[PDB]
Every structure is written in C-alpha cells, then in structure tokens.
Swiss-Prot record, chains A, J, K, L, M, N, O, P:
UniProt membrane topology term: Multi-pass membrane protein
Entry keywords, A to Z: CF(0), Formylation, Hydrogen ion transport, Ion transport, Lipid-binding, Membrane, Mitochondrion, Transmembrane, Transmembrane helix, Transport
Residue ranges crossing the lipid bilayer per the database entry: 14-34, 52-72
HAMAP family (alphabetical): ATP_synth_c_bact
GO CC field: cytosol; mitochondrial inner membrane; mitochondrial intermembrane space; mitochondrion; proton-transporting ATP synthase complex; proton-transporting two-sector ATPase complex, proton-transporting domain
Top-level taxon of origin: Eukaryota
Subunit architecture: F-type ATPases have 2 components, CF(1) - the catalytic core - and CF(0) - the membrane proton channel. In yeast, the dimeric form of ATP synthase consists of 17 polypeptides: alpha, beta, gamma, delta, epsilon, 4 (B), 5 (OSCP), 6 (A), 8, 9 (C), d, E (Tim11), f, g, h, i/j and k.
CDD domains reported in the protein's UniProt record: ATP-synt_Fo_c_ATP5G3 (cd18182)
Modification sites for N-formylmethionine: 1
Record protein name field: ATP synthase subunit 9, mitochondrial
Swiss-Prot record, chain C:
PANTHER family, sorted: ATP SYNTHASE PROTEIN 8
Membrane topology per record: Single-pass membrane protein
SUBUNIT field: F-type ATPases have 2 components, CF(1) - the catalytic core - and CF(0) - the membrane proton channel. In yeast, the dimeric form of ATP synthase consists of 17 polypeptides: alpha, beta, gamma, delta, epsilon, 4 (B), 5 (OSCP), 6 (A), 8, 9 (C), d, E (Tim11), f, g, h, i/j and k.
Name by which UniProt lists this protein: ATP synthase protein 8
This protein's record includes keyword Mitochondrion: yes
Function summary: Mitochondrial membrane ATP synthase (F(1)F(0) ATP synthase or Complex V) produces ATP from ADP in the presence of a proton gradient across the membrane which is generated by electron transport complexes of the respiratory chain. F-type ATPases consist of two structural domains, F(1) - containing the extramembraneous catalytic core and F(0) - containing the membrane proton channel, linked together by a central stalk and a peripheral stalk. During catalysis, ATP synthesis in the catalytic domain of F(1) is coupled via a rotary mechanism of the central stalk subunits to proton translocation.
Species, as recorded: Saccharomyces cerevisiae (strain ATCC 204508 / S288c)
Cellular-component GO terms for this entry: mitochondrial inner membrane; mitochondrion; proton-transporting ATP synthase complex
Family of this protein: Belongs to the ATPase protein 8 family.
Record lineage: Eukaryota, Fungi, Dikarya, Ascomycota, Saccharomycotina
Compartments, as annotated in UniProt: Mitochondrion membrane
InterPro entries tied to this protein: ATP_synth_su8_fun
Transmembrane segments: 7-26
Curated annotation (Swiss-Prot), chain D:
Family that this chain belongs to: Belongs to the eukaryotic ATPase epsilon family.
Pfam family, one: ATP-synt_Eps
Described function: Mitochondrial membrane ATP synthase (F(1)F(0) ATP synthase or Complex V) produces ATP from ADP in the presence of a proton gradient across the membrane which is generated by electron transport complexes of the respiratory chain. F-type ATPases consist of two structural domains, F(1) - containing the extramembraneous catalytic core, and F(0) - containing the membrane proton channel, linked together by a central stalk and a peripheral stalk. During catalysis, ATP synthesis in the catalytic domain of F(1) is coupled via a rotary mechanism of the central stalk subunits to proton translocation.
Keyword Mitochondrion attributed: yes
Gene coding for it: ATP15
Compartments, as annotated in UniProt: Mitochondrion; Mitochondrion inner membrane
Record note on quaternary structure: F-type ATPases have 2 components, CF(1) - the catalytic core - and CF(0) - the membrane proton channel. CF(1) has five subunits: alpha(3), beta(3), gamma(1), delta(1), epsilon(1). CF(0) has three main subunits: a, b and c.
InterPro entries: ATP_synth_F1_esu_mt, ATP_synth_F1_esu_sf_mt
Other known facts: Present with 4280 molecules/cell in log phase SD medium.
UniProt-recorded name of the protein: ATP synthase subunit epsilon, mitochondrial
Record-listed Phosphothreonine modification sites: 51
Organism annotation: Saccharomyces cerevisiae (strain ATCC 204508 / S288c)
UniProtKB/Swiss-Prot annotation, chain H:
Key word Ion transport present: yes
Keyword Transmembrane tagged: yes
Note: Present with 6540 molecules/cell in log phase SD medium.
Gene: ATP18
Homology family: Belongs to the ATPase j subunit family.
MF annotations from Gene Ontology: proton transmembrane transporter activity
Organism of origin: Saccharomyces cerevisiae (strain ATCC 204508 / S288c) (Baker's yeast)
Name of the molecule in the record: ATP synthase subunit J, mitochondrial
Cell compartments where the protein resides: Mitochondrion membrane
Length: 74, 52, 41, 59, 104, 132, 221, 37, 75, 74, 74, 74, 74, 74, 74, 74, 75
C-alpha cells in the first residue's frame, strides 16, 4: 500500500544518478575550453560566447534528470 | 486524434523541405545540368576545331 | 509465425528488383554515361 | 608563445631569441660576430611589374 | 630587372656589405614569408653558386619543403610529431630560414 | 648504436659533430626531452633553454636560443643552435635585468611590436630562470 | 502487406520509366536523383571491393541498396510502410546474405575458405584459440545486419506512434496551447527529420557492410 | 525507352539463389515445427 | 496502486541512467568543438554546421531516453 | 500476472539504460570528424561520410539495445 | 512460472547491458580510423577494409549479448 | 512507516553517488588548469577564473544529488 | 523449486555483462592499431600478428564470460 | 525498525561507493601536476598551491560520501 | 537449502562480471604496445617480453576473479 | 535477526566498489610519472615527492573504503 | 542461518567487484612503462623499479578485495 511511495522514493534517488552526465559534462567542456585558451590566447573572445550555449545545453541534461527525479518525489 | 497530429506534422515537413532542401538541391542539380551542358559544348568545340 | 504474404511475396519481389533493375536501369544509366563519353571524344 | 597567431612569424621568434641572447650577455662576450648580429641594415623594397619601388624600409 | 622586370616584385639592398649575419637573414626570411607568403607556393627555388675547391662554380639549387609536404609525406611516420605543436609549419619556416641563410 | 652522436652546430662556431654523449636533455617545444641512446626518431622545435649535455666532462650547461629536437633512428641526434652559452662567463644579472626592465618599459608600442615585446619579455624571464 | 510492397515497386519503376520525357542525354529532373546515387554506389564499391571481379559482384549490393533506402523512404508517410510492423524479412534476407557469402567463400576458395577465420600470421601456441575467436563472430553476424535496420526503422515507427497516442490533452482541454504544451509535436518533427537522416545513412552503411562481407567472401584476408 | 539487355542472371548470384532455397525450406519446415502458434 | 505502480515508478527511476550517455556526449561534442576551433580559427565556418548537427543529434538521443522514461513512468 | 508485467517494465528500463553507450559513441565519432577537419581543412569532404556512419552505427547500438526493452515493454 | 518468467525477463533486460562497451567501441574504432585517414589521405585503401573487419568483430560482442538476452526471453 | 523509511534510506544511499560528477569535475578541471599553466606560464589570470567557474558549476550538479539525498534521507 | 531457476537466469544475465569488456578491449586495440599504422605504413606486417593475438585474447576473456553465462543458465 | 535498520545498512554500503569521485579526481589532478612539474620546473611553485587546493576540494567530495555513509550508520 | 544455491548462483554471476578490468587492461597496455612499436620498431623485442609477462598476469587478474566465481558456484 | 546481519554483509560487500578510485588513481599517477621520467629523468627527486604523496592519498581513499567494509562487517 | 550464508555469498561477489580497478590499473601502469621505454629505449633500467612498485601495490589493492571475498565466502 505504501510500496508505491517507497518505490517512488528509490526511483527518485536513482534518478539523481542522472546528474553524473551533467557533472562530468561540465567537467570536460570547461577543461577543454581551458586547454583551447591555453593553446591560443587570442581565441578566448571567440570560444567563450559560443561556450555559453553549450553550457546551457549541458545544464539542460542536469535539470532534465533533476525534474524526472522530482516527478518521483512530489 | 493521433491521426490528426500526424497529417499536420507531415504537412510541416513538406513545407520545411520546400523551404530549405528544395532550393539548395535545385541549385546543386541545376549546376550539374549546366556542367553537363558545358562539357557537351566543349566536346562539340573540340570536334569542330579538329575538323577545321 | 504467419509469413506466407510477408516472406514469399517480398522474396519474389526482391528477385524482381535484382533481375529487372540490373537488366534495365543501371544498364541504361551506364548507357547514358558511355554515350556521353562517346560524344565527348 | 603566440608567434604563429599574434606574433610576426617563427623566423621573428628566432630573431628575437638570438637578439636577446647576444645583447643580454657579458661585456667581453660582445665580440665582432655579436656586433654584426646586432647591426641589421636589410632595406627591403617592394617592387612591381613596372619596378615601382614602394619603400626601402628597415628590417 | 633587365631580364624579367614584370616577374620581380621585391628587392633588398645593403646585404653584401660584409660576411653574413644570422639576424639579417632571418628577418629577410620573415619578410619573404609574410609579404610573399611562400607557404602558398609548393616549390621555392633559391639560387646560389657553389665552388668545388677554389675556382669552378656551379648554380646549385636546394629544394624547399612547404608545410603541405611536411604534414604529409611518403615517410613522415618515421619521425614522431606533435599535432598540437603545429610542427609542419614550424619545420617549413625552419627550413626556409636555415636553407636560405646557408645558401646566402 | 651505443650512446648518441650529438651534432651541436652554430652559424658562427659549431660545438659538436658526431661526438659521444650520454644525456642531451634539450628544451622541446612542449617541455624538455631526455635523450639517452637510440631515441625514437622525431622532429620538433626547441624553445630557448639549457641544453644539458652529459659527456665525459663535468656538468655543462648549454643555454640555447633556438633549434630542433631532430633525432635519427640511428641515434645521431642533431641539435641545431644559434647562440652558445659559456658555463660561467655568460651568467650575468645586472645587464640582463637592466635590458629586461628597459624592454618592459618600451613594451607599450603597437600590436605588431607589442607581440615582439611580450615574447622578448618571456624569453628574458626564461634567461633569468636559467641564470640560477 | 503484399499490396504495400507492390507500391514501392511501382514508385521506383517510375523513377526512370515515368521520368524521361524523351530519354534526353542531359537527363530529366528525376533521372538525376538516380544517376547521382548510382555514382555514389559505384564510387564506394570500387573503394571497398576494389580489384578484379568487383564489377561482377556489384549489382546485388546495388539492388539491396535501393531495396533498403526506398524501404526506409516509405517509412515517412504517416501510415508508415515499415514493413507493416513485422520487419522479419530483414532478418531472413540477412541470413540469406550470410549463406550467400559463405557459399561464395566455399566455392572461390574451398579449404582455403577455412583460412578466412585465421589471419596470415599468428603465433603457434595462440592460433587454436584465435580461430574459434574469429569463427563465432562470423557465423553470428547474420542477425547483426537485420537488427540494425529493424531497430532504426521500426523504432522510429513505434516512437512516432507512441508520441501521437500520448498526445491526448494538448489543445482540447489543456490551457497551454504553446510549445510548452506542444512538446509532443516538436519532438515528433525533430525525430522525423532524425528518422530520414538515420534511414539514408543506415542504407549507405549497410551497403558498406554487405560489400565488406562480399570482399571477405571472394577474397582472402 | 525500355531495353532488354543480356545480363548475368545466375552466373554470379547463384549462391544467393541457394540461400533463398534454404530460407524457403526453413520457413516451410518451421511453419508447424518452430511456429508454436 | 500496489506493486504494479511501484514497479512503474521504479522503472521511471532507473530509465534515466541512459541520460549519462546524452550528457557526456554533448559534453565531448563541445570539447571537440573547442579543441578543434582552438587549433585554427579559420575552420570554424566548416565545423559549425557539423557542430550543430552533432549537438542536435546528441540531445536527440537524450530526447529518446527521456521519452522512454516518460512512457515508463506513465500507463 | 501483475508481477510478470511489473518485471516486464523493470526489464524495459534496465534495457534502455544501454543507450548511454550510443550517446558516447555518436559524440566521439563526430568529435573525430571535427578535430580531423580542424587540423587539416582538405580532409573534411572525405571524413564526413564515415562520421555520419559513426552516427548510424553508434545509434543503432542503442536502438537494438532497447529493442529488448520494447519487447519487454510490449 | 510467474516469478520464473519475471526473472527470465529481468535476465534479458540485464543481459542487454552487455553492449555499452560495444556501442562506444565500435564507434571509437571508426573514430580513430577517420583520424588516421585524415593523418594520411592516401592510406584509406589499406586502413579501411581491416577497420571494417575489426568493426564486425567488435559488434560481435553486443551480438552475443543480445543473443543471450533473446535466450533469456525466448 | 517502515518500508517507506527503508526506501528513504535506500534512496539517499544510492543517490549520494551522484557526486562522481563533482569528483571527475575537479579531476579534469584542475588537470586542464595544471596543463595550461605548465604549457603557458604567462596564461594564468585567464585559466584560473574559468577553472574556478568550472569547479563551481561541476560541483553544483555533483551536489544536486547530495542535497536531494539529504531531503530524501530526512 | 522455481526461484532456483530464476536465480540461474539472473546470474547468467549478470555474467554476460563481461562481453562489453572484450568489446572495449578489441575495439581500442583496433583503434590503436590503425592510429599506429597510419604513421609509418611500412610498420604493418609486424604490428599485424601481435594485434591478432591481442584481440584474440581479449575476445577469449569475453567468450569465457559468455561460457560461464551459458553454464549458469544451462 | 528491523527492516529500517537493514535498509540503513544497505544505504551506507551504497553511499560508500561514491568515493570514486575523489579517487579519480585528486589522482588525475596530481598526475597532471607531476607532468607539469616535469615538463618545466619553473611552474612548480605556481601549480603546487593549486594542487593542494584540488586536494582539499576533492577530499571534500570524499568527506560528503563519508558522512552520508556514516549518517545512516549512526 | 533453496535460497542457499540461489544466492550461490547470484554470487557466481556477480563474480564473473569482474572480468572487465582484465579485458580493458590487457588491451590498453597492448594499445601502448602498438603505438610504441609504431614509434620505433627497432626495440620491438625490448618492449615485447615485458608486455607478455605483464598482460599474462593481467589475464591472471581475471583468473582470480574466475576462481572466486567458481568457488561461489561449486 | 537474519536480515540485519544479511544487510551488514551486503553493505560490507558493496563498500569495496570504492577500490576503482584508489587503484585507478595510483595507476594513472605513476602512468604519467613514468611517462614524464622517460620524457626526461633529470627531475626524479622532484617528481617523486608528490608521487609518494599520490600513493598516500589514493591508498587513503582505499583505506576509507576498507574501514567502511570492515565496520559494516564488524 | 540460510540468509546468513546467502548474504555472505552475495557480499563475497560484490566484494570481488573491487578487482576491476586492479585489473585496469595494473595493466595501464606498465602500459605507460612500455610507452616510456618506447620513447626512450635506454630509460627502462630506471623506469622499471617504481612502475613495478606501483604495479605490485595495485596487485595488493586487488588482493584486498579477493581476500575480503574469501572472508565473506570462507568465513
């Protein structure tokens, strides 16, 4: 009878495991941005503004996993 | 209806194709037509100059 | 497991492809190409 | 660092490195060869079809 | 000038004053690769005489290898290279400098 | 082949040509490379820095002003060079520091000159680190 | 299903028969749509099976190529012609192709065909393992061809079907008549452009794999 | 317009025809044995 | 209700681990973007349409896993 | 029969976990495409084909991975 | 037979996990293939066909994992 | 009250995994930091700001599992 | 009596996951192989047999995982 | 509280997995650190404070895994 | 007596999964083989025996996990 | 009383999944270490300090996983 | 008493997981060893000691999991 809410809770907990994609994602994109700026000091002004779009895209997967987790919490 | 949304979506991709794929493909195809035409005229020019 | 109208008919149809196309269509595409070659020399 | 992109070229990189090595040394190390290295007078001029000499700018 | 005035587009004076210096040659190479963009031309010809022992001379010419023929070559895999270091262009400019300096 | 045959050459006075050498630690484009014997063939530029040449003699610091890490498959490494570095005579601080400060002061020229000034500042810092 | 398979026969028969106004050398507007694909097919076939007998062993790879790419094309119409949602024919003819190249190798080589499962040079103590390492993969890649095409096409057909069925409350009672409430239509259109792309690319790549298996059959590697 | 050209009909596709016969035999034998329907 | 709905919600929770691939994919997509554009700036006009193809397809497969999760969470 | 369909749903979920490999593979083949064209411009018109085939194969891995999910689900 | 079929279905659903490695690796093989063919435009003739055979043998692992998943199901 | 609390604890325990994202975040973020400063000693005042932003945005999605786990644990 | 077979199926399904390990093995082997054969085409016939034995042993580990899966199931 | 305590034990046992974050993190950060100090010695004094900063900020992730594991235990 | 052997099979499977490390490792060191011998084939006989003695016990890591699985099975 | 000790055993067993951190960390730190030493050996006594610190940290993460496994066991 | 040994076996297996880290690391460390000796053939004599030291302690890390699996299986 309470198994529905219980399973909702473990489902949300394992749905937070969708945050690894976004975490290591932010990781690699920012690190490769750092490497690219290091290789070309004059390319920062042409790499960062485009990088913001992909930062939004990589926060998108994080908030998607967050909201599917939230559907199993509330 | 499930069959309502499908026909509208197909109309949507037909419009998108006519808007974007149709013009670019038209230019590429017409360029290839033109290339074939000019190589045919080049063959004619070679023939007529050889005959001359 | 009913495949009488899904396997046999499709198989025969693909024989029709393999035979008719290789007899008519790709040959006359190549005929177009070789005629262009011939007029181009 | 940025010789290829922001700098003049790789040849400019060798030029500045050699000039720094020769000039920033001991007084007794500034021999005749170092003097010739420091002295540059390559007055390159941009010609044209009609031999229009643009300018003999220093190197 | 008297042979092919149209083909010539760059002249440098005040070079044969005395024994060669590396700085002037390297600056000349930089100017040549900048204003003329020697990288565009697949082949670069340098003319310079060679005495055998004392008297007899020949117009020996040494080929110049561009970045196009350094990034790919029949035997470029023998020598380890770093793609991030842009060693094709680096070696192209280095040979353009060294060969021209010793040629002069 | 046993060891390496270092060919250290300069436009004014060559140093080595097919001479036995144990370690030819040289400042590669990325970092510095250690060469001991029969090293893998490679072609790569060298930034200015100490070209550490271990031979039968004592410690020999050889600061370079430009060259390539060109190694043959037959262990005949040829480190091209432009300017030599005496073990103790070259090491001086007053003139180097004064020139560095003067170049930093006159480093506010146009962008074409600004890049050259920045590269000169970085190579002067490299010289200061090499001084030890 | 039988009448639906005749339709693709009629459409591609009309590709040239119902296209050329007078069989002009310049080519009609739909003769180009087939000579371009013919040029691509001859190009990567001479790229992959390049050498002798490539021309004699090109036509059936070609026939499979149009079969599959118009079979993917007819899966765009809303009453999708994805083999009438059965798609077992792909598996059956993948097994057919596997038997075909097996017989190709067994006739061209014979006992040498058993050397197709062992490379030219192997260590003596390690060959008896690597032979059985390379054999079962070969007999197993007779379903891998089928599940690829099956996967892409019917996965697309059922995902559009599922999305359409799941789109019940979007504009009738739901007050959100914007893209927020029209996410079903947006991802339907995105996945249909994706479907067209993956269909054409998968037809080309399966042409590549079939040519590769034919190369393994008629030659030795 | 329509050209009936003499092309290889089975000289190169004969193993494919044997495979088709084999798949016909498999479908016929599995219509009652492996059908389970 | 009961074990059927509990299992439906458990499936809803599990199905999102596939978004690992989508997130890491868009991530390495932009990592390759940034590295390639940093190698040379003149290649940006040739890489950008393939760049948009790439990240669009990466959240396309992300969309695939999320709507499989959406179906798995509902009836 | 309730737990049978329950385990069908769990099987479908644990099957569709397996499209993360597809997600990595598509991105990495396109990544190879882009740095290959970046280091030399002239190779793009040859590299793009096998890049899109890299997409085709990498996605196909995910499609046949959760094909057993759909069979489990349906 | 109820829990038996439930566990068979769960076993198929987990067996299909055995293809994440196949999914990313059969992509990286072609990724490095196109990287190498960009390194030398002219090696394609000898780097391509053996890359495709390595492809078949690298898709083989996912092939057996779906085979055992089908065995679990059927 | 019993299995619900059990599910709460289980879900918190499995959800706190999601800080692998923050871990690999810091991992490759200061990996690229160190690589850039080592290869470009002059380029520090540019790499460091993007580096700390990378740390912050990676750990945000890394601990977006931890704070729901706390919300799920209690 | 029946969950014994259920556990057999679950064990086989979790055992067949070692296949993707062999997939990565053989795939990265082939990727390194063509990366190293793109440079120095001449070094092909010595990198061939040892490549053969390497992916042979990787696939051997994978097929042993398949074999223990079959043994647990059968 | 019987099954509640059992689930607490499972929750701690699955909380302790997440130390992989710190484990890979600090390690590859300091692998980059040792690479950087090797390639040039002049950058050592500039990278080492960054290295210990990463040390602290990833032992932070280790510590969160620690007290989420311990909170369920105690 | 029933769940005894049920968990025995579960343990045998969850021990057989432990082949991933050997599978990836033998091939990653072998990829090092490929790139090193491509860099210089003259020292092939210098890098070969060390590789043999290394990945032999790398497969022996498998062998220990398989011994654990067999003791979990019989 | 069976299930609480069963939970203790299960938690102790899963607490060892943390060894990926420690093992991969030591492996990569000395991978980069010996790569750097081969790239030049004149900095042995400078790169060795943070190398022994690298064992210290990675094996410390290992010891954390060990002590959780032991506390769950005992 | 049955669940005791059942969970003992389950714990032994989930302990012998921790051997994947060793199976990776012991191989990658001497992968870098051979990569370095390929870069510098004469430097094997000095890169061998500490590389095989880390290699052996990675063996020990895997042996911890093997031993705890035996403890949960043979004790």
């Amino acid at each position: 009878m309470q198994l529905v809410l219980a399973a909702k809770y473990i489902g949300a907990g394992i749905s937070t495991i969708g945050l690894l994609g976004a975490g290591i994602g932010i990781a690699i994109v920012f690190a490769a941005l750092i490497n690219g700026v290091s290789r070309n000091p004059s390319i920062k002004d042409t790499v960062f503004p485009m990088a913001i779009l992909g930062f939004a895209l990589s926060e998108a997967t994080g908030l998607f996993c967050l909201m599917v987790s939230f559907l199993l919490l509330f | 209806n499930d069959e309502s949304i499908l026909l509208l979506t197909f109309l949507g991709f037909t419009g998108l194709v006519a808007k974007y794929l149709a013009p670019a493909y038209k230019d590429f195809a017409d360029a290839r037509m033109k290339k074939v035409s000019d190589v045919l005229n080049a063959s004619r020019n070679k023939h007529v100059e050889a005959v001359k | 497991f009913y495949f009488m109208n899904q396997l046999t008919y499709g198989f025969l149809l693909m024989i029709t492809l393999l035979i008719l196309f290789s007899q008519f269509f790709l040959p006359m595409i190549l005929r177009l190409y070789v005629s262009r070659l011939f007029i181009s020399k | 660092s940025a010789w290829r992109k922001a700098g003049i070229s790789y040849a400019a990189y060798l030029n500045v490195a050699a000039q720094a090595i020769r000039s920033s040394l001991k007084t007794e190390l500034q021999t005749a060869s170092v003097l010739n290295r420091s002295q540059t007078d390559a007055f390159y001029t941009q010609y044209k079809n009609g031999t229009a000499a643009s300018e003999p700018t220093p190197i | 000038l008297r042979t092919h005035p149209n083909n010539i587009k760059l002249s440098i004076n005040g070079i044969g004053k005395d024994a060669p210096t590396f700085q002037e040659s390297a600056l000349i190479a930089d100017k040549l690769l900048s204003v003329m963009k020697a990288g565009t031309y697949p082949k670069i010809s340098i003319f310079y005489n060679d005495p055998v022992s004392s008297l007899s001379f020949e117009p020996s010419e040494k080929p110049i290898f561009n970045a196009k023929t350094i990034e790919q070559s029949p035997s470029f895999g023998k020598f380890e290279i770093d793609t991030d270091a842009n060693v094709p262009r680096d070696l192209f400019e280095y040979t353009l400098a060294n060969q021209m300096l010793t040629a002069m | 082949s046993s060891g390496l045959k270092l060919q250290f050459a300069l436009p004014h006075e060559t140093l080595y040509s097919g001479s036995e050498v144990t370690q030819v630690n040289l400042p590669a484009k990325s970092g510095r490379i250690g060469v001991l014997a029969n090293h893998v063939p490679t072609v790569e530029q060298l930034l200015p820095g100490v070209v550490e040449v271990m031979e039968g003699s004592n410690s020999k610091k050889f600061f370079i002003s430009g060259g390539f890490a060109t190694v043959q498959p037959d262990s005949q490494l040829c480190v091209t060079a432009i300017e030599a570095f005496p073990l103790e005579s070259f090491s001086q601080e007053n003139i180097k520091n004064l020139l560095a400060e003067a170049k930093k002061n006159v480093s506010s020229s146009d962008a074409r000159e600004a890049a050259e000034a920045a590269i000169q500042v970085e190579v002067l810092e490299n010289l200061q680190s090499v001084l030890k | 299903f039988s009448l639906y398979t005749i339709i693709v026969l009629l459409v591609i028969t009309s590709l040239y028969t119902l296209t050329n106004n007078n069989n002009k050398i310049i080519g009609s507007r739909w003769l180009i749509s087939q000579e371009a694909i013919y040029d691509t097919i001859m190009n990567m076939t001479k790229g992959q099976i390049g050498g002798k007998n490539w021309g004699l062993y090109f036509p059936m790879i070609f026939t499979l190529f149009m079969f599959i790419f118009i079979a993917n094309l007819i899966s765009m119409i809303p009453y999708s012609f994805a083999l009438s949602a059965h798609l077992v024919f792909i598996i059956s003819l993948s097994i057919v192709i596997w038997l075909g190249n097996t017989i190709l190798g067994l006739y061209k080589h014979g006992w040498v065909f058993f050397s197709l499962f062992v490379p030219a040079g192997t260590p003596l103590p390690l060959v008896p393992l690597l032979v059985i390492i390379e054999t079962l993969s070969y007999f197993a890649r007779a379903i891998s061809l089928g599940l690829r095409l099956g996967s892409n096409i019917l996965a697309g057909h059922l995902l559009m079907v599922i999305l359409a069925g799941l789109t019940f409350n979007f504009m009738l009672i739901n007050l959100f008549t914007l893209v927020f409430g029209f996410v079903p239509l947006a991802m339907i259109l995105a996945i249909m452009m994706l479907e067209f792309a993956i269909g054409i690319i998968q037809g080309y790549v399966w042409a590549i794999l079939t040519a590769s298996y034919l190369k393994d059959a008629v030659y030795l590697h | 317009m329509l050209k009936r050209f003499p092309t290889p009909i089975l000289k190169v596709y004969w193993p494919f025809f044997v495979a088709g016969a084999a798949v016909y035999y498999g479908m016929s034998k599995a219509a009652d044995l492996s059908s389970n329907t």
